[PDB]
Design a protein around this nucleic acid. Structure first.
Lengths: 493, 530
DNA sequence: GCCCAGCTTTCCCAGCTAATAAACTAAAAAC
DNA sequence: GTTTTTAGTTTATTGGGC
């Protein structure tokens, strides 16, 4: 039930060389990217196990005493101290702390390195699912000068693949470029391009820090006989402030909580079949059994029932009701599902049509109409999948979810006023990215926990990225504001 | 705030003409009225409702003086609806053997509103007529009728057996009794109804004439008595020197059940007889209880457990200035994809009410963004307590009004970058040419739209956003059933409900052959391994 | 701080209703 | 079976000028 991710970092000489730029060294980039995954995994209460290994170091630390391999952090749940530890190698001062604590630029043999990593998976007392190793290096030919090592590394790499361990390569920039065909083509389990900016390394790593996890596997019925299986995923989910937990003052140990129900008179425990459900209207009571309150909610069996196809232009942008889901074929339940799915996708795209369906997530839930909107795959310049291929499950509001509002005369602005506003709009133009803002509230909450768990001098204060940069904006706008006002607001306002 | 409504029902002889398998107008109208009264009862509004019947055998109304307005009965006088009204509708009220003047029924209906709304303050007075326009009637009171409706601010709606604009399915999507199948008397009555509605509403008056069938799958019967939304005052700020007074209303907001089920004792059927006591024990083995005077608050930080009291959390807690709607910047609309929409609402933002300066200012913004194909990225915070949100405000320009539509955008911590295998470049699941053509034929047969009335316009044949959430009227049918028949188990779902949740019978029929070809072209079988 | 605002099957003396979102509890299904 | 997710509750905190 717990996936495993080992972060493996190259400590060779070139990992600490920026290559003359206003950019971080591949090593700093790597450390910072690893901290990120550690922290995000905490923000979302992820139960995966993380590990941190370095190789090419002068100092070694592993159960078999293989040389130049340092297991900084064995596989375990992330915490405050482990994160704080990684921060010690951040930046230029970090570089100095790492090199003085472990040394760098020493020799090594990838085979020995991969053996140590595989062994960390075996030492896990917990049961595991996915076993993955993420390698960070800007060296594309480790043993191009030592066949005895190159050969052992390929064999071990192959043994990993046969053994169920996945090795992903997070290749970093190198003069002339990083050539995967030279060596790693036969090791890793179109590929991402090399990373040269933290941003890119982060997304590529984020794209793999967590494995797919369906919100539900359902049947998509074209009719009663033609049924395919699909996975429903939430590519977006509102990260909430983790709920509190009750502890025992004298030991800070978590406490279990049992909620029972008893007759007030006798004090006897009340079975679920010893109580009924009531609703009072006016001066009349209507009694139903628990079983019946659920039954009146029953309509369709869980699934997606195809209603037909509706042209996309008929679906309004302003009818949003709640976050959309993502639909992808689940070949593991119904063999043949992907082919039909792909066809539906290809054709819905050509005809700019959506598949209308009646949706029921689980048993005993009234249905909601949804529009499966065709979504074509999209990769950016780094070869990162920005948009996964499939269908956007768009929830449609029932008439009850719509609200009316009275409108007075339509008052429109003149070309001269719109022009002034246009000029203002163009001044405060910027490039929006779905991941540019952080949640002020969540961030502060964990900064606070950090200060308490690590006994820091003070709680770091989060930077509210949602607040407008007022002063900057004012200067950037100049007199456009006063101008706009003269065209719109009577001095007597 | 409150409304006075008179349901004017036709229970005349013709209302019972049963068509071999097709429900009579009387029974259809009876379902629509029950639908309306049920919602008014279970939602516990303050609207007052009267019920006038015409075509009845007897005569009982405050205008019969002088052998006039005969066969018109005021079954229920203006007052809060109750279970006795619903029961009468369902069981007592029987079809009549006569025929009454429908404009006379309207006049009696107007009388009820005029003589009984006395003193009480009603924001709205409304009359709903349910008839088949089968019989003769006088047209001498037309001007009198219209003059009183307008002067007394009384709105009107009509409900007939046929639409105004094959196997019959009540509440379905598709039938249209041709205006030719109706009698000549009905064509005359319909013209008058049209004239009346046009005088009262204008061009759109035609829109207030419905078929009983379509009424069952709409909220139109409540349309003129719907609770108007509350406005939210605030200033849209650009920098710190430009403020614009605005008012926001929620356009989309999921409707939920209001009444909760109270757990009670199966014998006393009372709530006080039940009580819940939540105790605490050491989760680890040796389940030892603990007293409330020994438990503190804490949080998890990965594997760490961190005690953090609500008092300390209260002060270190992130705190904002408060209410706001601040622009952070503007960007191409293309950089904002709908698949990233967040939250559980949509907000329409208008200039503050009656503020022309604010309106012109906002209109400037709207049109500039529209003319630049851009949108605003803003910080929205309901109040000083609410967690602040980042969101998009995009231009919404119509002919009757203009505004910005607000929808929340996601925070980085809300995203999940799950990678998915490519399907276009699939070396396993690429469909053959025949499979693609079968799907292509399936999509055409199952089209839910049509370029009808030849105007290059797309007519939606299955507009789901007009259909009411089925759980409500289903719940009401049950709540009522349990009230009028305590010993009986719950009734099954009404067919008209199922009929409105399904596509036009036309669509279903066309797809059969195409579906058959797809079943043979696309093998599908459940996995036995893994 | 201090209370606004109105309408009446509670009554006009007064009462009390309201809007809504952050929190929280419970049940289903994924793993 | 345990963990994430959600519908169903719950109850208080909230606005704004003077």
């Amino acid at each position: 039930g717990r996936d495993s991710l080992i972060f493996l970092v190259d400590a060779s000489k070139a990992m600490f060389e920026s290559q003359s730029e206003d950019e971080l060294t591949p090593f700093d980039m790597s450390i910072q990217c690893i901290q990120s995954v550690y922290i995000s995994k905490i923000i979302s209460s992820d139960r995966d196990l993380l590990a941190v290994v370095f190789y090419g170091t002068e100092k070694d630390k592993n159960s078999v005493n293989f040389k130049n391999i340092y297991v900084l952090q064995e596989l375990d749940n992330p915490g405050a101290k482990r994160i704080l530890e990684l921060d010690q190698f951040k930046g230029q001062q970090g570089q100095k702390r790492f090199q003085d604590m472990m040394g760098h630029g020493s020799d090594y043999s990838l085979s020995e390195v991969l053996w140590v990593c595989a062994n960390l998976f075996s030492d896990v007392q917990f049961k595991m699912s996915h076993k993955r190793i993420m390698l960070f290096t800007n060296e594309d030919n480790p043993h191009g000068n030592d066949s005895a090592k190159a050969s052992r590394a390929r064999t071990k790499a192959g043994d990993l693949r046969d053994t169920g361990i996945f090795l992903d390569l997070m290749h970093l920039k190198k003069p002339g470029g990083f050539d995967i065909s030279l060596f790693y083509r036969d090791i890793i389990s179109v590929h991402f391009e090399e990373s040269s900016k933290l941003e890119d390394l982060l997304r590529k790593v984020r794209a793999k820090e967590t494995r797919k996890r369906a919100l539900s596997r359902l049947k998509l019925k074209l009719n009663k006989d033609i049924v395919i299986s699909v996975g429903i995923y939430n590519l977006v989910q509102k990260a909430l402030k983790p709920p509190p937990i009750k502890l025992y003052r004298e030991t800070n140990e978590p406490v279990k909580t049992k909620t029972r129900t008893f007759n007030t008179s006798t004090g006897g425990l009340l079975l679920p079949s010893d109580t009924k459900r009531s609703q009072i209207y006016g001066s009349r009571q209507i009694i139903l059994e628990k079983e019946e309150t659920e039954e009146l909610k029953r309509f369709d069996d869980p699934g997606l029932m195809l209603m037909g196809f509706k042209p996309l232009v008929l679906l309004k942008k302003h009818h949003y009701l709640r976050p959309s889901l993502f639909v992808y074929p689940e070949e593991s339940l119904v063999i043949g599902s992907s082919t039909l799915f792909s066809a539906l996708l290809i054709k819905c795209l050509e005809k700019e049509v959506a598949a209308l369906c009646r949706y029921t997530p689980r048993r005993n839930i009234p249905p909601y109409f949804v529009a499966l909107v065709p979504q074509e795959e999209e990769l950016d310049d780094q070869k990162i999948q920005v948009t996964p291929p499939g269908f956007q499950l768009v929830f449609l509001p029932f008439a009850d979810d719509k609200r009316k509002m009275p409108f007075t005369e339509k008052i429109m602005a003149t070309p001269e006023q719109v022009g002034k506003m246009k000029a203002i709009v163009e001044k405060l133009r910027f490039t929006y990215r779905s991941d540019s803002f952080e949640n002020p509230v969540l961030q502060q909450h964990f900064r606070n926990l950090e200060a308490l768990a690590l006994d820091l001098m003070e709680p770091e204060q989060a930077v509210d990225l949602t607040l407008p940069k007022v002063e900057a904006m004012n200067k950037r706008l100049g007199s456009l504001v006063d101008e706009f006002k003269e065209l719109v607001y009577p001095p007597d306002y | 705030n409150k409304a006075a409504v008179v349901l004017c029902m036709d229970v005349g002889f013709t209302m019972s003409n049963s068509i071999p398998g097709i429900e009579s107008p009387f029974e259809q109208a009876k379902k629509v009225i029950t639908m309306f009264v049920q919602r008014q009862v279970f939602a516990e509004n303050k609207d007052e409702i009267a019920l006038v019947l015409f075509g009845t055998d007897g005569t009982d109304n405050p205008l019969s003086g002088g052998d006039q307005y005969q066969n018109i009965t005021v079954h229920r006088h203006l007052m809060l609806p109750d279970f006795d009204l619903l029961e009468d509708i369902e069981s007592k009220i029987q079809p009549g053997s006569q025929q009454a003047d429908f404009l006379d029924a309207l006049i009696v209906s107007m009388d009820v509103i005029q003589h009984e709304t006395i003193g009480k303050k009603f924001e709205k007075r409304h009359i709903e007529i349910f008839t088949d326009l089968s019989s003769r009637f006088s047209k001498s009171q037309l001007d009198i009728i219209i003059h009183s409706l307008k002067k007394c601010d009384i709105s009107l709606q009509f409900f007939l057996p046929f639409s105004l604009g094959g196997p019959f399915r009540l509440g379905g999507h598709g039938p249209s009794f041709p205006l030719k199948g109706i009698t000549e008397q009905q064509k005359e009555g319909l013209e008058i109804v049209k004239m009346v509605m046009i005088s009262l509403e204008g061009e759109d008056g035609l829109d207030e004439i419905y078929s009983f069938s379509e009424s069952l799958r709409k909220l139109c019967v409540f349309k003129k008595i719907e609770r108007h939304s509350i406005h939210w005052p605030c200033r849209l700020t650009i920098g710190s020197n430009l403020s614009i007074r605005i008012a926001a209303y929620k356009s989309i907001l999921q409707e939920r059940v209001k009444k909760t089920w109270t757990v009670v004792d199966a014998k006393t059927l009372k709530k006080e007889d039940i009580q819940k006591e939540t105790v605490y024990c050491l989760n680890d083995d040796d389940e030892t209880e603990v007293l409330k005077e020994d438990i503190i608050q804490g949080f998890r930080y990965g594997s760490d457990i961190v005690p953090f009291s609500k008092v300390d959390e209260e002060q270190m807690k992130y705190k904002s200035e408060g209410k706001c709607f601040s622009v952070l910047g503007f960007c191409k609309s293309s950089q904002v994809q709908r698949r990233f929409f967040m939250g559980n609402q949509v907000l329409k933002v208008f200039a503050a009410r009656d503020d022309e300066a604010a309106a012109v200012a906002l209109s400037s913004l709207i049109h500039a963004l529209d003319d630049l194909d851009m949108v605003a990225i803003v910080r929205y915070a309901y109040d000083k307590r609410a967690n602040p949100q980042v969101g998009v405000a995009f231009p919404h320009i119509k002919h009757n009004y203009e505004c910005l539509v607000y929808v929340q955008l996601p925070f980085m911590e809300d995203l999940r970058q799950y990678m998915f295998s490519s399907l276009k470049n699939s070396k396993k699941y690429a469909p053959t040419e025949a499979q693609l053509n079968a799907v292509d034929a399936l999509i055409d047969s199952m089209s839910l739209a049509k370029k009808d009335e030849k105007t290059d316009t797309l007519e939606d044949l299955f507009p789901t956003t007009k259909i009411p959430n089925p759980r409500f009227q289903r719940l009401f049918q049950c709540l009522l059933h349990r009230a009028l028949h305590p010993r009986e188990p719950l009734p099954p779902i009404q067919q008209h409900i199922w009929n409105m949740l399904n596509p036009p019978a036309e669509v279903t029929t066309k797809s059969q052959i195409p579906l058959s070809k797809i079943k043979t072209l696309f093998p599908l079988i459940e996995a036995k391994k893994k």
